[PDB]
Scaffold this active site. Structure first.
Site, PDB file in Angstrom:
ATOM      1  N   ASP A   1      -3.203  -1.380  -2.449  1.00 48.98           N
ATOM      2  CA  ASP A   1      -4.414  -1.786  -1.739  1.00 48.98           C
ATOM      3  C   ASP A   1      -5.679  -1.249  -2.399  1.00 48.98           C
ATOM      4  OD1 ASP A   1      -3.299   0.665  -0.946  1.00 48.98           O
ATOM      5  OD2 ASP A   1      -4.354   0.659   0.986  1.00 48.98           O
TER       6      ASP A   1
ATOM      7  N   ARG B   1       8.117   6.424  -3.356  1.00 51.77           N
ATOM      8  CA  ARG B   1       8.413   7.102  -2.100  1.00 51.77           C
ATOM      9  C   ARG B   1       7.533   6.530  -1.001  1.00 51.77           C
ATOM     10  NH1 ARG B   1       4.086  10.190  -3.128  1.00 51.77           N
ATOM     11  NH2 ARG B   1       3.915  10.822  -5.323  1.00 51.77           N
TER      12      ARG B   1
ATOM     13  N   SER C   1       0.826  -1.207   0.000  1.00 48.41           N
ATOM     14  CA  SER C   1       0.000   0.000   0.000  1.00 48.41           C
ATOM     15  C   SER C   1       0.866   1.265   0.000  1.00 48.41           C
ATOM     16  CB  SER C   1      -0.962  -0.024   1.184  1.00 48.41           C
ATOM     17  OG  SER C   1      -0.260   0.068   2.407  1.00 48.41           O
TER      18      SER C   1
HETATM   19  O1  LIG Z   1      -3.096   2.828   2.056  1.00 48.43           O
HETATM   20  C1  LIG Z   1      -3.856   3.824   1.378  1.00 48.43           C
HETATM   21  C2  LIG Z   1      -2.946   4.748   0.608  1.00 48.43           C
HETATM   22  O2  LIG Z   1      -2.111   5.447   1.535  1.00 48.43           O
HETATM   23  C3  LIG Z   1      -1.199   6.365   0.925  1.00 48.43           C
HETATM   24  O3  LIG Z   1      -1.927   7.410   0.330  1.00 48.43           O
HETATM   25  C4  LIG Z   1      -0.358   5.705  -0.135  1.00 48.43           C
HETATM   26  O4  LIG Z   1       0.620   4.861   0.479  1.00 48.43           O
HETATM   27  C5  LIG Z   1      -1.158   4.871  -1.109  1.00 48.43           C
HETATM   28  O5  LIG Z   1      -0.257   4.117  -1.927  1.00 48.43           O
HETATM   29  C6  LIG Z   1      -2.087   3.956  -0.357  1.00 48.43           C
HETATM   30  O6  LIG Z   1      -2.929   3.246  -1.253  1.00 48.43           O
END
Ligand SMILES: OC[C@H]1O[C@H](O)[C@@H](O)[C@@H](O)[C@@H]1O
Ligand SMILES: OC[C@H]1O[C@H](O)[C@@H](O)[C@@H](O)[C@@H]1O
Lengths: 480, 480
Positions: free
Chosen positions: B205, B166, B151
């Site tokens: 995710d 990042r 995620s």
């Molecule tokens: O986890 C939800 C969302 O959180 C952040 O915005 C990032 O790390 C995204 O890549 C991720 O999908």
């Protein structure tokens, strides 16, 4: 392509439009009819053509913590009879075993005379079959408590007593009117060896739906959405709600004070809103509605709101439209079986047409019409039939929102707390399975006086749990 | 009571208001950023301050009939890591065993040096512990295929490869940036004897949420509500959608034609909308938002939309407001531990305040503030603290609706068929459990250019299935 036919269809579709101003009129009129219906009965309850507004003698909304041994429940709907056993485990959870069977056509035909004993003997026998299959080891021993969901108007006198006011939908059994249906059922249970089965509660299917949702809704979900209406959009249509005891003026004043002293504040009301505006002072009415009410229905002069909304009648509306277009030599009925065959077109047939696609040359419409009445059609004929079907169902859905909007307005249900919403528990094949019916209901709610901001505070939730859980909850409370 | 404090709080609450005009501006601006984000960038992907709009190389939405042997899935979120085995049984059904574990604090502290190997070794051991507990008899034998739900923003180059763009949220492991996280993970699996576990898929995710709903949604439920967005409102916030291949101009033009020739028409896009308007050209901005972005967050200059919306930051917004009211000598912090304790107030804290009641002297608020930072409060102070919390969460919910409205408008998703509705699959603690967050999102959707008639056609559904089903579905498709 026949332009003359296309314009005739477009003009008929326009007759089914329900405007925002109409929704506003019917909403305020419905509240007026609710208030008149709560006043002391003038005439005989069986002949009164107003909004029944029947006190159910159910005053307590389940908490979800009810628990007890296995209860029995029997549910006579408009189309099917079902027996089930419900074990209320508490914490919004239950275990249910059920058997569903269609009501034999024999009971809806008047060619031969049918009596109450025929119906309740059949219901008692199925109850025996159920106990033999799911509880074979204690059929004749246990002191079963049974809740009876009876989806017909009943002059309720207690949780366990009430006389049939009048049949609706497809039933026309004469000698049942004016008889306590709990006793009729109990007698037939006694006569086949199930005297140990005690029918101790009698509920409408609306009442049972509301009680079931109050029980199964989690503490978190219910703190956000309080169930305030249990309603039905299946073979027929109806709904219930909690009314303040002080406003139920038809209730015996001494009985009211007794209940108020016991800590009770409301009693569930079975509106019987299928009989809303039986005198047609404001409901939309086409020539097709008149023929259905006066010729093809079992109960002329009653349940007129229902005859525009519920699943028993939407298909018949299409039939009457096609017969009228053929009488005008605008639509060729071919060698179909539509003539002199009332209700051959079903709302299930229409459900295959509502969202059929022209990219498939409307083949689901072609197949469904051939299956129902062997009506062969051209593509242009199906395109026009689909326009008619979509007009019938949209009117049904728009009218369906009126009783809900009225109840919420009258009871100021939307004046809650921060982030507080209300749940409307819905059961029945139309609201659950007819494509788009719920979406169109929510549109009509947004056009109603509660506005779009009100519609967002209302959650039309499909309660497929069933009124058996509701009936079981009433049986748990009652004494054997 | 305190008039000076009441006026300061009421003035802060007004700063968090998001009007219909702003929603419209942000919605149209979001679409502009989508289109710029789909054009080929030549700059460093890690330094780009625009909307990432990352192709996921996922082109097929599951049908619901997918079936196969047990797949593995690994899910590294912002707070927890979970391993699970998913058995796709077909017909929208699956069997899942999972183990969820919190990410050790070691990975969020900078006092000690942290490396990718630390993170992926720990994940390898958890995978081993899982396989030892739930699949003890075939841990070292089976040819396991694993889907990896990561995620975090990844420069995806295929279904199974992509370098970290990042970190976000609490992660700041330096040496992970620019490395293929599938290879890093596979190396540590190999190095503890699990080389028979092949990581064959890498998904965000959001992507996993969308794929899971496409599989589990019944054919009937999916025929009415087509899943078009998979999004997250938890620790962080983000969403994905299916974009037409022709519009994904950063994709190799030859690769586009190959996919188009294979019958493909769309590819899922990971918008990374947490990084929407990182330059603050239009997003609402308070002094508290600046402090969170520039002092208290791990990624200054990035994820600025997210820092106004997601659960990692909402509580910190309140803390910075109280510190300003204490700086102004309007609010007494007493012996609390708010100062020099960033993130001590959590979104969980705020969830106890959102719907606290005055009938209880706001005791839930008192207990939640005492539990988090030993902040004693008076009733009148809690009344005002509640107003601040309700302003923070409403602004978060209103902003949360903007990306969803934008995607639906850009793709012309709400007007496709008659009775056409779309499902937006939502996962995350905030949207699922924060009182009223979804309700307020729907209000903002109705104020957006899609209008109330559009909001009624959008189902914000909680996807409790998980991104493990999504990752498992990708692994089943992939080759060992
Ligand atoms: O986890 C939800 C969302 O959180 C952040 O915005 C990032 O790390 C995204 O890549 C991720 O999908
Ligand atoms: O079944 C729905 C509904 O149908 C009719 O309107 C009546 O018989 C009601 O009593 C019943 O609840």
């Amino acid at each position: 392509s026949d332009p003359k036919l296309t314009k005739a269809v477009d003009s008929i579709c326009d007759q089914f439009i329900v405007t925002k101003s109409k929704i506003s009129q019917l909403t305020e009129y419905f509240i007026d009819c609710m208030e008149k219906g709560l006043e002391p009965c003038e005439s005989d309850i069986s002949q009164n053509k107003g909004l029944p507004m029947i006190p159910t003698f159910v005053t307590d909304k389940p908490s979800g913590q009810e628990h007890g041994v296995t209860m029995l429940a029997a549910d006579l709907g408009g189309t099917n009879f079902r027996v089930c056993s419900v074990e209320l485990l508490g914490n919004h959870e239950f275990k249910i075993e059920q058997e569903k069977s269609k009501i034999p056509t024999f009971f809806f035909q008047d060619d031969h005379h049918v009596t109450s004993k025929d119906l309740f003997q059949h219901m008692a026998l199925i109850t025996h079959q159920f106990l033999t299959k799911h509880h074979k080891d204690v059929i004749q021993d246990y002191k079963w408590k049974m809740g009876f969901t009876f989806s017909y108007p009943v002059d309720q006198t207690s949780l366990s007593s009430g006389k049939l006011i009048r049949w609706t939908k497809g039933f026309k059994i004469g000698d049942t009117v004016g008889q306590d249906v709990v006793q009729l059922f109990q007698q037939e249970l006694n006569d086949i060896g199930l005297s140990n089965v005690h029918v101790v509660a009698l509920t409408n299917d609306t009442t049972g739906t509301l009680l079931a949702r109050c029980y199964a809704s989690s503490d978190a979900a219910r703190a956000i959405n309080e169930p305030v209406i249990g309603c039905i959009f299946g073979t027929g249509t109806n709904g219930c709600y909690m009314e303040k005891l002080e406003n139920i003026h038809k209730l015996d004043p001494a009985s009211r004070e007794e209940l108020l002293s016991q800590g009770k504040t409301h009693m569930c009301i079975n509106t019987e809103w299928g009989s809303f505006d039986n005198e047609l002072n404001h409901l939309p009415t086409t020539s097709y509605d008149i023929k259905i009410d006066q010729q093809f229905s079992t109960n002329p002069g009653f349940q007129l709101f229902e005859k525009r909304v519920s699943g028993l009648y939407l298909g018949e509306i299409l039939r009457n439209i096609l017969l009228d277009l053929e009488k005008q030599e605008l639509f060729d009925l071919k060698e179909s079986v539509l003539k002199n065959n009332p209700f051959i077109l079903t709302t299930e047939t229409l459900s295959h047409i509502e969202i059929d696609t022209v990219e498939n040359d409307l083949q689901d419409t072609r197949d469904a019409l051939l299956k129902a009445a062997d009506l062969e059609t051209t593509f242009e004929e199906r395109v026009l039939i689909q326009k008619l079907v979509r007009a019938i169902s949209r009117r049904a859905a728009f009218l369906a929102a009126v009783p809900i909007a009225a109840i919420l307005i009258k009871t100021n249900a939307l004046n809650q707390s921060y982030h507080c919403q209300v749940e409307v528990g819905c059961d029945g094949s139309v609201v659950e399975h007819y494509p788009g019916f719920r979406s169109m209901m929510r549109h009509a709610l947004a056009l109603s006086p509660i506005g779009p901001e009100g519609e967002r505070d209302v959650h039309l939730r499909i309660s497929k749990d069933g009124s058996g859980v509701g009936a079981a909850l009433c049986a748990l409370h009652a004494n054997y």
